[model samples]
Target: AVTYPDSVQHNETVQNLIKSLDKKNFETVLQPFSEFHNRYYKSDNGKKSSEWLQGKIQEIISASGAKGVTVEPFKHSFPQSSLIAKIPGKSDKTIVLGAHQDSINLDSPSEGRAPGADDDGSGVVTILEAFRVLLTDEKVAAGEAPNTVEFHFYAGEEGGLLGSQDIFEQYSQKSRDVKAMLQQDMTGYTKGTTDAGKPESIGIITDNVDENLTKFLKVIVDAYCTIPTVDSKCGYGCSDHASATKYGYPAAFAFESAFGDDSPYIHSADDTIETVNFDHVLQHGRLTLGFAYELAFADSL
Candidate 1:
């Protein structure tokens, strides 16, 4: 067994990246997009945001490795968006760690900010953190060959998983060997109220998880979390896995639970950094990473 890092720096790199994102300083580079509630379809601004975030991800990956990091960007139409990432693995079968990179433009661009620290931003960071942990691990790095993973950051999720939909369509048509999919749609924020709301629990949407994947989600959660979580036996809802099913691939989504009472600030300009709780988000990231490592490296049954 390998040990991952801890302490403030465990996620400090990602937090710094979030802090560095200032909509005002780089509006041209980072465009505006609508929240999930506001957008019925993909936005041109959403595509732009996705691209900028993609570039940021490449920067982080480059920083993690001395060299030999192969990354590329793929664009798709129809809903119209892009997927940026690194793919590693030799088996026809693969596991994917994915998140939507676009932030909802809650207020007009004319307004001051759209920090979007949680909503899906935390999801993005969670993906990146997991990737960094697994990649930076000396064991994996020095191993003979590890089961490859596709670290995916997509656009147009708030626009109804447009990028994911298009990519899944392409992969299905091409017979891409995607065995399982894991997503963190809203890991940064939990949906709880002061009154009587459910604490943070994961939503493993049915349409997403394959018939075989659900049983262990509970086992993994029980090992990782001290807090109580109500598992969605039927799976709850999701961002992109709905489309993955079209390809006959099994998938699941992980998110913080207010049991749907998630932050009211979502999809609004109020969705700022202050609205997020980093500790909780960090836990989400760590647990997701460990589960992924188990799925990827453990000998297949």
Candidate 2:
């Protein structure tokens, strides 16, 4: 059951192999596709595109040796993008690492690529990469981590957390006890230049996240990257995790703010991949890896 493809990229061959249920289930599936991307969440994609993309994302996760994948049916209005894959946690209690995968208005009508690389593209990629790393080894590996992790690619976030709210409701109904929720948002930009400026640090979004988590993140930043990590009272119920609060899930988000003082692409047609720095993304990856390991493997006092 733990078999996997040679490559986790989900190449054309990969997609073909993963094309399950065929056209029969096509129209019947991705019901929330429209609501998550537009109309309600306003992310901007039709059913087919959204479903295909989410499938590809899951294939990548599957290739990394995860068989705990399934989809949670969440209802929304018509014509929105929706994520199609959900990986069940190893335990009834779950740990969530989430990000929004929908992009919008990176350019005018003439330029159609709303690649949102920094705005959130980077965030999604971080979660995906983390998922890849965690699932790469067979049987969770030794001294590796603990907790059953679910990597979420939430839709309808820019539309105002529609996709995330759906997840909260579904989980709450089942009494899903989420140990914690980790949100990765806007982490593709660095604070500043290396010389004559603040180093390339991360601005953490703390919605009252455990201080120990923050301290461990700090230690991770101190030990792993040249840049330091800063903790701020980002806000509560601001993103998807906040939505989780209704279900009593303590949540925290991460952002590369402090440097985002003047960058205004969030709700506009300016958030593009050009603004993203892969190095910053990788740094976030490293820090996340550290915290994830601690949260999963090390027992909390």
Candidate 3:
């Protein structure tokens, strides 16, 4: 069984870290990430993009000078491998944050343009920015947190959650103690909400997720984000978080907007960087940074 914090902790540390989140950093990665012809699971570009992302994460870790932090590829049978960056702590228990790295053109499937800018490119950088800032903290960088933390960039998510399922299956076999997992599948577009005359907000997936974890995330958004959170649902098997849930790990998902008001351009060629709102992405970054920090040092959960 899993538990959640009744309220937000680590406000001072979280606030300081989130303040350094830069939109340019998000753009720096998303621009080239979405440019891949298509991050189709089995495509050459998919494999190349995975390798590129691994190197990018490695570069970030190296630049931070954070010791005991390591980034490596979690190989799958497929060409594109998942990426994991681990920041060890005092205990073996872990908290995970995740986003898919693959994109697909629903119409073309393969060998077609799938920018996936808002779909997941936004999510990729949103958490990446958070991870980057989290490391800057002296204690966290020195591996002083109570529980370990991991950032997962999954591949083949569009292919029935293949990559995440594989990873979670292994974790289950190993009896790994994962305290909580949060998935950021989309965190960039807000046009649909604005066009619908709705206030911009973070979409917190309420259904098909651990109730405690979802409640805790709402508390996190209230503490760390400028915008409010609106309850949303993405049915069964919506994203990689489902994989964790299936493996009996508590997991939650945070999205850009209400389900109907989310990016209409996802999984299509038009899902380009021009459509992404960096401001919205930054808000998610704050939430991600806060979530990781609070849980990493959590007394109990």
lDDT of all predictions? 0.57, 0.54, 0.92
Looking at model 2, report the run of 10 residues with the lowest lDDT sum.
1-10
Clashes of each: 5, 12, 0
lDDT of 3: 0.92
Q: Per-prediction TM-score, please?
A: 0.75, 0.71, 0.99
**Model 2 Cα lDDT, one tens digit per residue, 1-301:** 0111121221332222222212222112222221233222342343444565566576676566555655443446744555644444335556677777665553332224454556566666666565556555454433233455566777676666777888888888988767667777777665343433666667776654544344445554565455766656654455676676666676666667553341466544455555656767766676555545445543331
Better of 2 and 3 by TM-score: 3
Task: List, residue by residue over 1-301, the lDDT tens digit for candidate 1.
Answer: 1121122222433333333333232222222332322221245545555555566667766777625445566675533355556445445456777877665564553233455556677777767666666666554444422465677777666656777887888888898777667777766555363236445555444455665554444444555544445544334345776777767777766667644456667666777655666656666665566556656554451
Candidate 3 local lDDT, 41-126, one digit each (tens): 88888999999999889988999989899988888888999999999999988999999999999999778899999889999999
Ranking by TM-score: 3, 1, 2
**Which pairs of residues collide in candidate 1?**
88-148, 89-148, 191-258, 191-262, 208-251
TM-score, structure 2 vs. true: 0.71
